[PDB]
RNA sequence: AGUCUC
RNA sequence: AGUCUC
RNA sequence: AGUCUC
């Protein structure tokens, strides 16, 4: 008659396991004001304080189990009509100190999704708060000071009637955490760089609106007196010269109603805009469909001859610049029935079968992004 | 595997009060974090210090998680002017993994060579993650180094840089948050 | 619109065969064809709830 | 790479 | 039966 | 089910 408690399973350390229904932790409801501008942050907070709001199923399970396998997964949702449109990032990042920067540029190398609900309605993204290993917790988060940043990178093109609300649904995924270190004087292949080149704005007109973004990108971003830094883009300042595929991923961040082809390609940093034949160099012309937001451009190492220099002095000139550039123009026209520029984002997301040479001492500051 | 010969990066330059005022006290003291890139100071006069936004110094800052072994180099440069037989200086420097006293010291040193000297030792991170640690978090009570002086007569010993190496198996994960590092001039 | 607009409705005999579909008060067939309206719900533009039940 | 999509 | 125990 | 679509 009488029971044996030693045989009971209370002691089960098993990660969770389940459905979506049953894997859910938390939803966050993030407030996305009629007349938001961009560069405006929506909500930065520790990780642990989104995971924490509702009683979910597996609620009290990511309070109570010590260490949890499966990454943490998010779907975000929100849809706006195709006359408008705005440019959303959500950025996770192991830690942070003090009052620390939002610009996109800083916050979107470890694991950070940027979207445009006039195009894509329903997001999702899938991480590992935990990059040495294959496991988190709660407390580790919370300890840690993992945190989320919710910025707009761009405004609305045209205001909506009312006020906007982005719903976050968060869950324990079932894919397993898988760790991403860096070992500093030895990168993998391929690189993960994760780096934001700028956002790029091209104006309704005829102008061909030339941009030049420079591939010297040791040395982090530029700022008023002061430089913006992020964990990648510091290893890769590290080494003296290099060269590799590289890879954008080119974003749509204004409303589907402003249509313009935009045109691609490496060149010096000494060509007059209005050089005719640009065009005679390989490039590349890329235009979105209504609903398209995302494009991925890959630029060979062949566009390369050789390892260009992983900083350049700040203050040097474009016709004394001896390193590559990647160059964006406007092909034939922005156009719209609506007011507003055509404004795309540019991030080098890696570098395959890179290659570094020497060790860098350093140079004092670095260049604006756009 | 990326390398070359000779090419560490500087870190911080600390340089002596120059309103110390010998009467008040003989010594003064300064402490470097090498993993955070922070400065602490005496309140014994006006300190000039400053971190250089070198390669290494901008990496440090912002790698959430460290691990491996980095070299570190410091160069005292003195007052000239003082002739060599009235040298009466010397400067203690001090390893800990935290500035709270009730840490002892993992390593201890005694430099008195007129006018200069330098300092040239290893250190290595080793954290609870995976091997991996995390500057001064409260999760497993996580640490850091600190480099510790306490210079006796300050009007000699007056100069301090340090200078970083990073080594083939310093590994890192992660990125800290940070503000934006100013640059001066 | 801009104008008053016209939905034109073209009536063909079809090439397939009619079928009955009659109701057995007592004694349902599965599925039971209900084809009852449950109402016409309204969501105004905001960030409300708007709970319906 | 990863994430995502399918 | 069940529950429980084993 | 049916209708529809393919």
Redesign the interface.
């Given at each position: 008659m009488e029971t044996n408690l030693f045989k009971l399973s209370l002691d089960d350390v098993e990660t969770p396991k389940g459905s979506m229904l049953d894997l859910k932790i938390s939803q966050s409801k993030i407030a996305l004001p009629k007349n938001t501008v961009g560069g405006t942050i929506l909500r930065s907070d520790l990780l642990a304080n989104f995971l924490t709001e509702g009683n979910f199923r597996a609620s009290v399970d990511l309070q109570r189990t010590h260490r949890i396998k499966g990454m943490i997964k998010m779907v975000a949702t929100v849809g706006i009509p195709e006359n408008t449109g705005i440019a959303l990032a959500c950025a996770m990042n192991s830690s942070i100190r003090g009052r620390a920067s939002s610009d996109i540029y800083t916050i979107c190398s470890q694991d950070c999704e940027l979207w445009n609900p006039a195009c894509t309605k329903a997001m999702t993204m899938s991480f590992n708060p935990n990059p040495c290993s294959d496991a988190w917790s709660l407390e580790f988060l919370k300890r840690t000071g993992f945190h989320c940043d919710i910025i707009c990178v761009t405004g609305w093109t045209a205001t909506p009637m009312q006020d906007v609300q982005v719903t976050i649904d968060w869950f324990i995924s079932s894919q397993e955490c898988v760790p991403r270190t860096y070992c500093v004087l030895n990168p993998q292949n391929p690189f993960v760089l994760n780096r934001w080149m700028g956002k790029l704005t091209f104006p309704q007109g005829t102008s061909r609106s030339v941009k030049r973004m420079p591939l010297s990108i040791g040395g982090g971003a530029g700022a008023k007196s002061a430089i913006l830094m992020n964990m990648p883009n510091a290893v890769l300042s590290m080494w003296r010269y290099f060269v590799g595929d590289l890879v954008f991923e080119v974003s749509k961040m204004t409303s589907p109603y402003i249509k313009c082809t935009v045109s691609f390609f490496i060149a010096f940093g000494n060509l007059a805009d209005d050089t005719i034949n640009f065009e005679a160099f390989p490039h590349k012309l890329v235009q979105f469909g209504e609903i398209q937001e995302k494009v991925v451009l890959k630029f060979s190492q062949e566009e390369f001859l050789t390892a260009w220099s992983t900083q350049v002095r700040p203050a040097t000139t474009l016709l004394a610049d001896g390193c590559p550039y990647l160059y964006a123009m406007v092909h034939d026209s922005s156009v719209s029935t609506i007011p507003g520029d055509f404004v795309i984002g540019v991030k080098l997301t890696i570098i395959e079968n890179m290659c570094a040479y020497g060790l860098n001492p350093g140079i004092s500051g670095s260049r604006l992004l756009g | 595997?990326?390398?070359?010969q000779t090419?560490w990066?500087?870190m911080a330059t600390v340089r002596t009060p120059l309103n110390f005022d010998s009467s008040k006290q003989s010594f003064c003291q300064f402490s470097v974090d090498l993993l955070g890139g922070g400065i602490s100071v005496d309140k014994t006069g006006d300190w000039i210090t400053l971190v250089?936004?070198?390669?290494?110094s901008?990496?440090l800052?912002?790698?959430?998680?460290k691990k491996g072994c980095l070299m570190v180099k410091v160069v005292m440069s003195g007052n000239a002017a003082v002739k060599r037989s009235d040298w009466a200086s010397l400067v203690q420097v001090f390893l800990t993994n935290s500035n709270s006293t009730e840490h002892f010291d993992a390593c201890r040193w005694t430099k008195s060579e007129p006018h200069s000297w330098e300092l040239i030792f290893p250190i290595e991170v080793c954290g609870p993650?995976?091997g991996?640690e995390?500057w001064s978090?409260?999760?497993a009570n996580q640490t850091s180094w600190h480099l510790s002086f306490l210079v006796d007569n300050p009007k000699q010993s007056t100069t301090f840089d340090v200078l970083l190496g990073?080594?083939?198996?310093?590994?890192?994960?992660?990125?800290?948050?940070?503000?934006?590092?100013?640059?001066?001039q």
């Open positions: - | 595997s990326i390398s070359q090419v990066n500087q250089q936004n070198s390669p290494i901008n990496l800052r912002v790698a959430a998680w993650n995976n991996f995390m978090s409260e999760w990073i080594s083939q198996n310093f590994e890192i994960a992660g990125n800290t948050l940070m503000p934006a590092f100013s640059v001066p």
